[PDB]
Design an enzyme around this catalytic site. Structure first.
Site, mmCIF file in Angstrom:
data_model
loop_
_atom_site.group_PDB
_atom_site.id
_atom_site.type_symbol
_atom_site.label_atom_id
_atom_site.label_comp_id
_atom_site.label_asym_id
_atom_site.label_seq_id
_atom_site.Cartn_x
_atom_site.Cartn_y
_atom_site.Cartn_z
ATOM 1 C CB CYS A 143 57.317 0.869 -89.669
ATOM 2 S SG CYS A 143 56.997 2.610 -90.061
ATOM 3 C CG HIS A 173 57.223 3.827 -86.123
ATOM 4 N ND1 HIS A 173 57.828 2.948 -86.991
ATOM 5 C CD2 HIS A 173 57.316 3.261 -84.891
ATOM 6 C CE1 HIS A 173 58.239 1.883 -86.324
ATOM 7 N NE2 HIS A 173 57.967 2.063 -85.042
#
Lengths: 334, 76, 359, 367, 164, 109
Positions: free
Chosen positions: D16, D315
């Site tokens: 990510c 993330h």
């Protein structure tokens, strides 16, 4: 190391000593010099073992939360060069409190005691609050706003303790003004048999006075109470060591309105033609706060007109509109 | 020569170095006065991150130059 | 269909949640009114141990802690009503209120009249509308816009409807405190609510705080208490203090409502409390006409109506009465089974409404 | 019915950091265009780079990825690009899935590769030049001025006092026989694209471990940096800003199938947008450098966020402003794409363990 | 219980009860909110009194501004029997207290306390103190730690006028 | 508002109409609200209106309201203010909200 067990004591073969923990439990430890005498003083956290129940160390004082009813503002930003036109209320105020604080030594040599207190009643909406903070700034007092409804607790005594803590911090921080929002909850006790219900309020007050006269010769702490108007209270206006002084606020006059307008006109744009004296004749029985609302209305004319400043006319029109307590515009009758 | 390293707190500190010093030497000097482990230091200069075996001269870092010290926010 | 998709969502949610519980179990673990991290192994002072309670205390003076990010533990955490303070692990919001009131984000009632309330609307417009739309104008002049407005004449004159309408246009919160409820008879409780309403107000700034009825609470103060003016003045005097004591002007608005004008005190009138007095009392003949014209647009009507004639039969009205004439006129038609309204119907509704108002 | 959602990248496991970075770069119009039109026959600008061939392959693989985003392939898997990046920059091949990485580090290395391939055509759009004043704190007659420092981003330093991005940007411009010298940067040249780094990641001394500053730091949608400029340059940029503001204000004043009508409206909206661009452009200063911001004002166009304990956990996501509708934002949560409103973006200022802004991209006002 | 037990050990003792309305009310209105805590307290004091334990080397002194929120129990003989009231002074009382207050004070001139007494009408010691400080205020202004006879005449009169 | 008399015509009309619309007839004793202490009534009134709107359409039947039928020009003390707080609470809820038939009221006297 924290998490650790503190103990809030309120207690002043071989020798036995009782400790009161804040878990509300009394415990035995000896005072044979295994546990030193100087690790006990009332009103104080002292550091007790969790499962060995014995004072290893002493920790700083505290009883309830610290500054629980008090606001602390070390030294307001205001001055009597910011608040001005209130000059006569400056004279009264200075003679009652400021001069006993400054020249404390002088009161000691003279060998009178110092009054520590004033009570003010009379209308704000002139910068009563603003004057109080000014005095605070000038003397270099710590300004403490103590709200009378917070004490007034429905719970036992705790309120009494709060009054004592106020004095205690006030005496450490000296000079100090204790500025009391309301007077309705260290007072309003009546003389009837409903003075029963209103106990909490008699007790917070009484203690604060008993404590001031306790220390009347030394000027460290000031007490000021403020309200719109004087309420029923227990006698206290009769004594130097209580709130001796009873200071009235009148209304402004032409010189005062004009100074108040010159303070206003720094802050905001004007076309620099506006004559305070002339506008002051045109306003009848205006107070300081209301001269400040005219400045806002003068700007609301300006806002509609597409001007970013105000002319004389713009202010004249501002007065005509409401300020909500008095407004000069009368010319109707046929 | 004296160069500058803008730490993580926004402050500039000074460092004494030689054009011959490698980025590893410099990072060690930064650890000395800032306390951050070299393997955690990421130095930026002129938009380039400085590589460990290269030297100050390689990057043309002259006296009074300012390096920007940054760490890392790993993720994936 | 609807069932399989709901299970699929549960299954998904749950697995993440089970893992997360165990992690929470291993560490042994925002509004808030005191902080209470009931253990604190992780974290003057160089580590946090903060727990604000009567029965025990753990005290550290120093907050912050960008690593570990503090919080966790026996969870109520953030800033303290004693100022030891969880400063900035998971959002504190300045001592944030756990005592609620009724919030109505964007109240929906748009512009009941715009004609015949023409001046009164325009007063609202300067104070409230324009300072949200442009703060810079106000700033440049150097003025601060009216802090408080008093609205008079009877309540429910379409006083409410108009207020709500400007609040919709600006996307601002209605914060309703009703004066009558506050009334407790237990020590200090009302005034406590007032302090937390303003703390909460400052956080939520751009809001019209509606204070229903000053006949209810703060109606006198000349008594010097009585048991029922003594909590009531306590609440009242406290509420003023907060206002001149500063809350931002040009964001937070306080609007007062009153049926009768004999409750008011010099304390209440003064600037920093009330600055505006907006009328919703008695309008003109030309004015009554406009408000009639405005409610009957939406309605079907069959011809022969002149508003002027309807207006004529009112010797004195309030806005409440006008709203009653259009709606009542429609009812005579529905009984006869009709969609349209007629000159006869409007007359019939004036006669009924005024006469009942008398006495 | 007709409007298609933008597509995202599938997360391969801790990637990510790459996905969020690619969405932000794709949003930068000039960069997107030069990547989409890259022809390997054109070589590189800096063939002094010893690893030239791998930088070119990075660009080639980015172009393929960008072609898949532009032509909405419901999901793009950047496998070959990741492999290529790992060959060039082995830091990104660290394991322990592959280890999560600092998006700033990726951004920096991608900038390096794009500078090698495209040269000034790329780098001039991002360059910030400084005038640096160096004064002996012990002697204020010992003054030296340098004009040769530059960078391609500004750092927003975050401490316990920091509440607004401006606070941290100002702190980032200053730093401190031998003496202590104050070194004070003011901007003498602004880029058309301004990248701001929130300095959130740090080495914790207490734990000898990577950590993260969670503090709430409010950023603006419309950024004005006049106070960071030299007096001479501010005078120039403020003059431009005041003419552009006049255009903005004037702007705010002013048988087909259903598919055909939508496509006509898109064409109309693009034409209207282009006509306003031309109106702003009339007021650009005469000697504007290629890649230079006309004024001292920017609009926010993208935000890379992170949620997690440090740069090797949690993330990353991207929030991207729509290119026509300035009120519309897209959330790229890897391959899960959604529309969000301005309030959601504001909430990215941070505070606690919430997803928060890490890198912000601004584009010059009137562009 | 503790207060009484300790009084007996530490006898002689004064037990001084500051404003008695809260441990010795009458009821708010005949109703109750918290005015039963007041009754719980009050029965305990009446019980010790009525008891086998007798007051004679432990003395209890009650104080309150008003006698109109004392309970009828207390007002009845045998729980209070001695009731001292705080009176108006004599001419003689005022003189002594003026002389005493100005003795610790620094002054130019012998003071005629006798005038000062005339200038009041029934000032008890607290009222007299306000007059002292008032004189002193014109002396801080006159840049001195001494006061004239002249100050003293003006001072007693300004305090009289501003109240009763 | 229905005025007539109990068991004579007031009550009959109210039973009949409520049943015809198939709404819960929920009967409030006006006088008993009457609770003579500062805390009880305005809440009682609020709690009524709340539950009604939730579980709409619903009939708030207020039987024989005679005793909060005074208005006063000035409010003082507890002895006038109590009465006035209860009266004002009804007035404000009506004025505060508007409903075309989430809450219907029959007032009776």
């Amino acid at each position: 190391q924290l998490p650790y067990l503190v103990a809030n004591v309120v207690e002043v073969v071989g020798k036995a000593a009782v400790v009161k923990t804040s878990s509300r439990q009394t415990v035995f430890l000896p005072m044979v010099g295994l546990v030193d005498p100087d690790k006990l003083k009332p009103n104080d956290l002292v550091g007790v073992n969790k499962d060995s129940y014995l004072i290893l160390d002493t920790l700083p004082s505290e009883f309830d939360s610290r500054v629980k009813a008090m606001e602390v503002d070390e030294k307001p930003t205001e001055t009597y060069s910011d608040v001005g036109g209130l000059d006569k209320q400056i004279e009264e105020l200075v003679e009652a409190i400021v001069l006993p604080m400054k020249r404390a030594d002088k009161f000691k040599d003279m060998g009178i005691r110092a009054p520590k207190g004033a009570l003010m009643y009379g209308p704000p909406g002139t910068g009563k609050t603003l004057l109080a903070r000014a005095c605070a700034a000038q003397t270099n007092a710590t300004f403490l706003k103590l709200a009378a409804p917070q004490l007034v607790q429905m719970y036992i005594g705790e309120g009494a303790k709060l009054v004592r803590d106020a004095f205690a911090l006030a005496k450490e921080k000296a000079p100090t003004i204790i500025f009391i929002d309301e007077l309705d909850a260290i007072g309003t006790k009546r003389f009837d048999s409903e003075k029963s219900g209103d106990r909490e309020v008699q007790r917070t007050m009484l203690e604060l006075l008993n404590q001031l006269d306790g220390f009347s010769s030394d000027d460290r702490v000031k007490v000021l109470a403020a309200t719109n108007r004087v309420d029923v209270l227990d006698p206290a206006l009769l004594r130097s060591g209580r709130l001796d002084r009873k200071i009235e606020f009148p209304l402004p006059s032409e010189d005062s309105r004009a100074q108040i307008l010159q303070i206003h006109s720094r802050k905001m744009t004007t076309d620099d033609d506006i004559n305070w004296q002339e506008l002051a004749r045109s306003t009848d029985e205006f107070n300081g706060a209301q001269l400040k609302a005219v400045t806002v209305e003068a700007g609301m004319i300006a806002l509609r007109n597409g001007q970013s400043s105000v002319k004389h006319e713009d202010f004249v029109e501002g007065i005509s509109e409401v300020q909500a307590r008095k407004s000069k515009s009368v010319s109707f009758y046929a | 020569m004296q160069i500058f390293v803008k730490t993580l707190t926004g402050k500039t500190i000074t460092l004494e170095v030689e054009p011959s010093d490698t980025i590893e030497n410099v990072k060690a000097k930064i650890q000395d006065k800032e306390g951050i482990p070299p393997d955690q230091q990421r130095l930026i200069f002129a938009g380039k991150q400085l590589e460990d075996g290269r030297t100050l001269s390689d990057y043309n870092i002259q006296k009074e130059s300012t390096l920007h010290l940054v760490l890392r926010l790993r993720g994936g | 269909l609807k069932q399989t998709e709901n299970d699929l969502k549960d299954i998904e949610a749950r697995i993440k949640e089970k893992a997360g519980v165990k992690e929470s179990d291993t560490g042994l673990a925002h509004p808030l009114q005191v902080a209470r991290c009931t253990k604190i192994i992780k974290g003057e002072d160089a580590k946090y141990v903060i727990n604000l309670k009567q029965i025990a205390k753990f005290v550290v003076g120093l907050g912050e802690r960008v690593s570990p990010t503090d919080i966790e533990e026996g969870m109520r955490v953030g800033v303290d009503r004693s100022k030891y303070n969880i400063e900035l692990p998971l959002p504190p919001r300045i001592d944030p209120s756990v005592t609620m009131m009724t919030v109505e984000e964007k109240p929906d009632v748009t512009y009941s009249d715009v004609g015949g309330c023409k001046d009164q609307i325009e007063k609202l417009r300067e104070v409230v509308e324009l300072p949200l739309l442009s703060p810079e104008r106000f700033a440049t002049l150097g003025i601060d816009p009216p802090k408080g407005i008093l609205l008079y004449g009877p309540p429910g004159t379409g006083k409410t409807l108009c207020a709500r309408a400007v609040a919709n246009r600006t996307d601002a919160t209605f914060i309703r405190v009703i004066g009558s409820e506050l009334v407790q008879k237990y020590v200090g409780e009302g005034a406590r609510m007032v302090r937390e309403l303003f703390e909460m107000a400052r956080t939520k700034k751009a809001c019209i705080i509606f204070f229903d009825e000053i006949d209810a609470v703060g109606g006198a103060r000349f008594d010097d208490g009585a048991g029922g003016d003594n909590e009531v003045q306590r609440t009242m005097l406290e509420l003023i203090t907060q206002l001149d004591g500063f809350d931002p002007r040009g964001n937070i608005k306080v609007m007062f409502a009153t049926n009768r004008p004999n409750t008011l005190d010099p304390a209440l009138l003064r600037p920093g409390r009330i600055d505006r007095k907006v009328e919703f009392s008695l309008p003109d003949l030309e004015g009554r006409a406009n408000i009639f014209r405005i409610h009957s647009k939406s309605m079907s009507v069959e011809r022969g109506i002149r508003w002027e004639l309807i207006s004529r039969l009112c010797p004195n009205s309030t806005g409440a009465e006008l709203r009653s004439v259009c709606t009542e006129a429609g009812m005579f038609a529905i009984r006869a089974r009709r969609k349209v309204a007629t000159e006869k119907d409007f007359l019939k509704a004036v006669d009924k409404v005024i006469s009942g108002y008398k006495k | 019915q007709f409007a298609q959602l933008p597509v995202g990248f599938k997360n391969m496991g801790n990637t990510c950091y790459l996905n969020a970075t690619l969405q932000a770069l794709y949003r930068v119009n000039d960069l997107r265009d030069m990547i989409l039109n890259y022809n390997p026959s054109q070589g590189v600008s800096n063939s002094g780079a010893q690893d030239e061939e791998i930088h070119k392959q990075i660009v080639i693989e980015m172009k393929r990825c960008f072609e898949n985003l532009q032509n909405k392939f419901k999901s793009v898997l950047p496998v070959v690009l990741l492999n290529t990046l790992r060959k060039c920059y082995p830091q990104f091949a660290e394991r322990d899935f592959y280890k999560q990485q600092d998006a700033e580090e990726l951004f920096t290395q991608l900038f390096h590769s794009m500078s090698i391939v495209f040269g000034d055509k790329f780098s001039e759009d991002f360059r910030i030049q400084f005038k640096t004043t160096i004064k002996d704190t012990a002697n204020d007659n010992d003054i030296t001025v340098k004009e040769n420092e530059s960078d391609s981003k500004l750092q927003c330093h975050i401490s316990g006092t920091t509440n607004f991005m401006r606070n941290g940007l100002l702190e980032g411009l200053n730093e401190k026989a031998n003496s202590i010298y104050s070194v004070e940067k003011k901007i003498s040249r602004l880029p058309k694209f301004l990248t701001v780094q929130y300095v959130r990641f740090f080495w914790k001394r207490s734990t000898n471990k990577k950590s993260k500053i969670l503090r709430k730091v409010v950023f603006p949608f419309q950024l004005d940096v006049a106070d960071m400029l030299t007096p001479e340059y501010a005078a120039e940029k403020v003059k431009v800003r005041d003419e552009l503001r006049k255009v903005e204000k004037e702007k705010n004043e002013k048988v087909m199938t259903p598919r055909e009508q939508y496509e006509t409206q898109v064409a109309l909206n693009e034409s209207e947008k282009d006509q306003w661009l031309e109106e702003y452009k009339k007021h650009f200063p005469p000697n504007l450098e290629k890649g230079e911001n006309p004024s001292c004002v920017y609009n926010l166009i993208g935000v890379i966020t992170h949620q997690g304990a440090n740069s090797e956990s949690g993330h990353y996501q991207a929030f991207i402003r729509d290119e026509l509708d300035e009120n519309k934002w897209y959330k790229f949560n890897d391959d899960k794409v959604s529309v969000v409103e301005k309030e959601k973006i504001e909430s990215l200022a941070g505070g606690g363990e919430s997803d928060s802004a890490l890198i912000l991209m601004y584009k010059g006002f009137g562009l | 219980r503790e207060m009484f037990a300790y009084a007996k050990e530490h006898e002689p003792c004064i037990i001084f009860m500051d404003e008695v309305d809260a441990i010795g009310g009458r009821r708010f209105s005949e109703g109750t909110s918290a005015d039963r805590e007041i009754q719980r307290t009050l029965m305990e004091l009446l019980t010790q009194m009525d008891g086998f334990d007798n007051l004679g080397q432990t003395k209890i002194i009650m104080a309150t501004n008003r006698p109109d929120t004392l309970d009828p129990a207390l007002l009845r003989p045998g729980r209070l029997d001695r009731k001292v009231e705080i009176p108006l002074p004599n001419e003689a009382g005022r003189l002594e207290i003026f002389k005493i207050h100005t003795a610790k004070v620094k002054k130019t001139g012998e003071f005629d306390f006798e005038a000062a007494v005339k200038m009041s009408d029934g000032f008890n010691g607290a009222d007299i103190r306000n007059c002292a400080t008032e004189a002193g205020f014109f002396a801080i202004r006159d840049d001195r730690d001494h006061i004239n006879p002249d100050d003293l005449m003006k001072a007693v009169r300004k305090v009289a006028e501003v109240k009763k | 508002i229905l005025y007539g008399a109990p068991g004579t015509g007031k009550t009959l009309l109210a039973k009949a109409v409520a049943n015809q619309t198939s709404a819960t007839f929920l009967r409030i004793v006006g006088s008993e609200l009457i609770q003579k202490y500062l805390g009880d009534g305005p809440r009682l009134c609020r709690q009524i209106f709340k539950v009604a709107g939730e579980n709409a359409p619903s009939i708030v039947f207020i039987d024989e309201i005679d005793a909060i039928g005074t208005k006063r020009y000035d409010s003082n003390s507890g002895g006038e203010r109590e009465i006035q707080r209860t009266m004002l609470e009804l007035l404000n809820q009506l004025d505060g909200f508007d409903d075309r038939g989430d809450v219907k009221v029959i007032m009776a006297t």
